[PDB]
Amino acid sequence: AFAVDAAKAYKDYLASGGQPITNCVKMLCTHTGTGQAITVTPEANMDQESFGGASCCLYCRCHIDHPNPKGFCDLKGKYVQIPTTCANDPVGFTLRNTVCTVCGMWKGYGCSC
Amino acid sequence: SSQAWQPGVAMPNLYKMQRMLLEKCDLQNYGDSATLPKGIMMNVAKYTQLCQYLNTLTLAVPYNMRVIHFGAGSDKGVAPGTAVLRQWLPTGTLLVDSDLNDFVSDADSTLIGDCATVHTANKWDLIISDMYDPKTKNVTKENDSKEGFFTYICGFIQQKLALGGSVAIKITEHSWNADLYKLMGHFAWWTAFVTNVNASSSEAFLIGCNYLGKPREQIDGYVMHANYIFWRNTNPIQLSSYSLFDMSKFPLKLRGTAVMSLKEGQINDMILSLLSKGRLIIRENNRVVISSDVLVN
Numbered sequence: 001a002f003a004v005d006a007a008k009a010y011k012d013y014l015a016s017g018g019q020p021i022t023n024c025v026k027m028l029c030t031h032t033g034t035g036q037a038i039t040v041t042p043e044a045n046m047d048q049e050s051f052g053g054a055s056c057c058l059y060c061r062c063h064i065d066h067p068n069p070k071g072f073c074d075l076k077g078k079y080v081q082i083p084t085t086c087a088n089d090p091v092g093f094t095l096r097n098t099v100c101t102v103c104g105m106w107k108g109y110g111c112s113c
Numbered sequence: 114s115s116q117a118w119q120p121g122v123a124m125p126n127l128y129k130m131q132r133m134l135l136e137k138c139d140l141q142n143y144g145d146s147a148t149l150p151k152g153i154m155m156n157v158a159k160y161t162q163l164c165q166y167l168n169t170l171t172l173a174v175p176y177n178m179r180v181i182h183f184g185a186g187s188d189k190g191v192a193p194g195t196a197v198l199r200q201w202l203p204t205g206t207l208l209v210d211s212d213l214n215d216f217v218s219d220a221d222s223t224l225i226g227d228c229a230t231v232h233t234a235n236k237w238d239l240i241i242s243d244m245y246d247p248k249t250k251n252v253t254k255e256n257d258s259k260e261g262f263f264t265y266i267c268g269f270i271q272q273k274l275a276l277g278g279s280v281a282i283k284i285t286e287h288s289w290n291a292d293l294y295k296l297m298g299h300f301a302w303w304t305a306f307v308t309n310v311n312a313s314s315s316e317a318f319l320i321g322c323n324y325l326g327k328p329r330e331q332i333d334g335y336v337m338h339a340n341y342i343f344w345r346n347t348n349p350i351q352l353s354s355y356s357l358f359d360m361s362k363f364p365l366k367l368r369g370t371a372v373m374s375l376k377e378g379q380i381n382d383m384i385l386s387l388l389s390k391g392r393l394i395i396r397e398n399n400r401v402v403i404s405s406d407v408l409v410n
């Protein structure tokens with residue numbers, strides 16, 4: 001029944017006041033994109049930063065297995081859009097938030113459904 | 114008016130034609146820095162300017178393009194250059210990554226280990242190398258042509274680059290190779306490109322544009338590197354990040370270049386001319402298979 005819960009361990013390290021995971025790869029772009037959360041190419045709008053996806057997966061960055069049967073990363077090879085006011089912790093932001101399955105946008109940061 | 118709005122500066126043709134002796138590199142702007150946009154790392158900026166420059170050449174861009182990137186890992190354990198490559202290349206481009214040390218990457222596949230352990234079954238359309246050994250920056254030794262990973266790169270280009278394919282390979286004052294320069298004469302066009310954001314360094318990318326099978330020009334590599342140092346020594350390049358603020362035309366134009374598998378002396382003078390304008394790639398289109406050799410105890 002034992003399993004390492006890296007997501008909980010990171011959430012609690014942040015609540016204790018830990019420096020968030022650094023060196024996520026911020027891309028140059030026009031900042032006139034669709035604003036959707038996870039995309040094939042950077043899509044930040046004027047209020048988002050775009051990051052290379054792999055450098056924002058906790059599992060990828062921590063060399064931990066991804067939490068699903070067929071170890072698949074839905075960030076690797078993609079670009080992730082982060083509101084500029086949260087962009088100091090892109091790894092945290094993607095952990096704690098959810099993508100609207102019809103809208104494409106972050107729930108609470110873009111989905112208007 | 115200036116090259117400061119360009120992504121970088123290419124070695125002018127008149128400098129390629131000199132016959133200079135090797136000098137120490139002494140850059141006027143040695144201690145300058147471009148001011149990067151907020152939160153943007155030097156490697157992202159540098160690869161973006163390389164890609165903005167490559168956008169101006171006649172790169173062959175087939176459907177199902179194949180790109181391999183050597184020296185992709187960084188000391189932070191991520192791969193900023195390949196994130197830029199993946200942004201630039203058409204969606205669905207096959208991108209393979211490699212470095213000596215472990216790193217996390219956006220490539221479709223990553224091989225860790227010395228590049229000499231890397232084997233691939235197929236040919237590639239575009240080869241990018243940022244491989245660099247910092248211990249070559251030693252001013253107390255004579256600056257000779259270097260071997261190491263440069264020996265692999267030269268063999269890899271001659272065996273695994275499709276005719277029509279292109280190359281961009283990082284060099285510096287001390288990290289260079291005479292045969293790599295000689296190989297640039299087997300392309301329809303070549304240059305040494307300095308990015309504006311890193312113009313305080315002797316770094317350049319040796320860019321070979323549209324590979325032909327054969328020498329088009331005879332190039333002496335020892336002389337050409339001396340010509341490169343002479344160019345850098347007498348032409349200060351103004352540090353600049355201006356081109357990073359206009360990304361509206363960044364992605365590589367999908368041109369649907371034709372791919373054909375010709376053999377031998379099927380390479381007509383008509384074929385060579387199509388290669389030379391970026392309008393033809395010659396290689397097979399089998400599955401892409403790669404592997405690294407593992408030595409056991």
Ligand SMILES: C[S@@+](CC[C@H](N)C(=O)[O-])C[C@H]1O[C@@H](n2cnc3c(N)ncnc32)[C@H](O)[C@@H]1O
Pocket residue numbers: 156183184185186187188192193194195211212213214226227228229243244245246261262
């Ligand atoms: C400055 S780094 C590359 C930076 C990286 N391209 C980026 O996007 O920031 C130079 C890299 O070349 C790699 N390298 C040097 N010699 C090598 C060799 N013989 N085989 C494979 N990789 C090598 C190093 O491991 C190092 O990661």
Ligand SMILES: [Zn+2]
Pocket residue numbers: 100101102103104105110111112113
């Ligand atoms: Zn929605």
